[PDB]
Amino acid sequence: VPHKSSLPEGIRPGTVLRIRGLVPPNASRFHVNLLCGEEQGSDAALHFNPRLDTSEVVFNSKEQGSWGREERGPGVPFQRGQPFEVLIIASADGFKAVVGDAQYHHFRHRLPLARVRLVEVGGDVQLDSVRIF
Amino acid sequence: NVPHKSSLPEGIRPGTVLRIRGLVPPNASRFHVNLLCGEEGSDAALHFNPRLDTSEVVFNSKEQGSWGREERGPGVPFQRGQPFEVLIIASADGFKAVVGDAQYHHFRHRLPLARVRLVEVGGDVQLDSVRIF
Numbered sequence: 174v175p176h177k178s179s180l181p182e183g184i185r186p187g188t189v190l191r192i193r194g195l196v197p198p199n200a201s202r203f204h205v206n207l208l209c210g211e212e213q214g215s216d217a218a219l220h221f222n223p224r225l226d227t228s229e230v231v232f233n234s235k236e237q238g239s240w241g242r243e244e245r246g247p248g249v250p251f252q253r254g255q256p257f258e259v260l261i262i263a264s265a266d267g268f269k270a271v272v273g274d275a276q277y278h279h280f281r282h283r284l285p286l287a288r289v290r291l292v293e294v295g296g297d298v299q300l301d302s303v304r305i306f
Numbered sequence: 307n308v309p310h311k312s313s314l315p316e317g318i319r320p321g322t323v324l325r326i327r328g329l330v331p332p333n334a335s336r337f338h339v340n341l342l343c344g345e346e347g348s349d350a351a352l353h354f355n356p357r358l359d360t361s362e363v364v365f366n367s368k369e370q371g372s373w374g375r376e377e378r379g380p381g382v383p384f385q386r387g388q389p390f391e392v393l394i395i396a397s398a399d400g401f402k403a404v405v406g407d408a409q410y411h412h413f414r415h416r417l418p419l420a421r422v423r424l425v426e427v428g429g430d431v432q433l434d435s436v437r438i439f
């Protein structure tokens with residue numbers, strides 16, 4: 174079951190998204206999206222896309238249906254059949270992705286942080302908990 | 307119990323996250339997390355003090371040797387013999403203290419974030435991990 178929840182107040186520097194779950198044994202990909210709205214194809218301030226199928230974790234943003242320049246994290250700190258914990262931490266400069274015990278990648282803001290109003294977690298992932306602090 | 311004491315010579319900013327994982331000993335009385343202005347009784351931007359003996363969690367600041375106005379959180383989200391996870395999250399306006407799965411208390415800043423240059427975790431606590439993200 175995907176997570177999709179509204180952040181009508183937005184998120185500010187000091188917001189922490191904590192995701193706990195398990196990558197299923199047959200997983201291809203899953204995604205964490207910080208979106209500007211609920212509509213179809215909404216702009217994305219952050220698309221965080223662990224890809225088991227292609228052994229990469231892609232970061233990107235989306236504006237007017239156009240993806241930006243992809244960033245990739247170092248290695249893939251996810252494994253099929255294994256549980257994980259991700260922090261997505263918002264600062265004034267960007268989003269810090271923490272996986273397990275280590276900062277994994279820093280994605281500088283493209284879209285103003287104030288554009289974020291929705292969080293979505295979906296794809297091939299079993300979710301134990303999603304929290305916004 | 308081995309305490310933690312580490313330097314933040316660059317300071318901390320909105321989006322800094324202190325994650326503490328540990329266990330409250332079965333005979334614990336109290337433990338503390340301090341964000342301090344320096345290496346010495348240095349000023350404390352945050353003193354986070356779970357007290358199992360008196361069933362309270364106290365928050366305070368200290369300047370020039372004098373404690374400020376105490377704040378207390380609702381209940382005690384710690385138990386002797388039980389493991390715990392605390393997030394101390396810095397925003398522009400204060401520190402969000404998260405325990406377990408929920409925000410426990412918000413402590414508005416008394417000292418500027420730029421003056422924080424040391425993290426201490428000590429007292430009656432067994433530390434499994436202390437991370438600054």
Ligand SMILES: OC[C@H]1O[C@@H](O[C@H]2[C@H](O)[C@@H](O)[C@@H](O)O[C@@H]2CO)[C@H](O)[C@@H](O)[C@H]1O
Pocket residue numbers: 220222231232233240241243
């Ligand atoms: O950039 C995020 C999107 O990537 C799309 O796939 C890219 C792929 O990463 C890139 O290597 C290149 O081959 O073009 C593809 C299509 O843009 C995904 O399809 C999309 O879901 C986002 O993950």
Ligand SMILES: OC[C@H]1O[C@@H](O[C@H]2[C@H](O)[C@@H](O)[C@@H](O)O[C@@H]2CO)[C@H](O)[C@@H](O)[C@H]1O
Pocket residue numbers: 353355364365366367373376
């Ligand atoms: O930062 C709070 C400090 O409190 C001290 O204890 C207080 C106590 O909380 C209060 O209710 C009253 O009884 O006065 C005491 C003395 O200030 C602690 O002793 C100190 O270690 C700090 O935690």
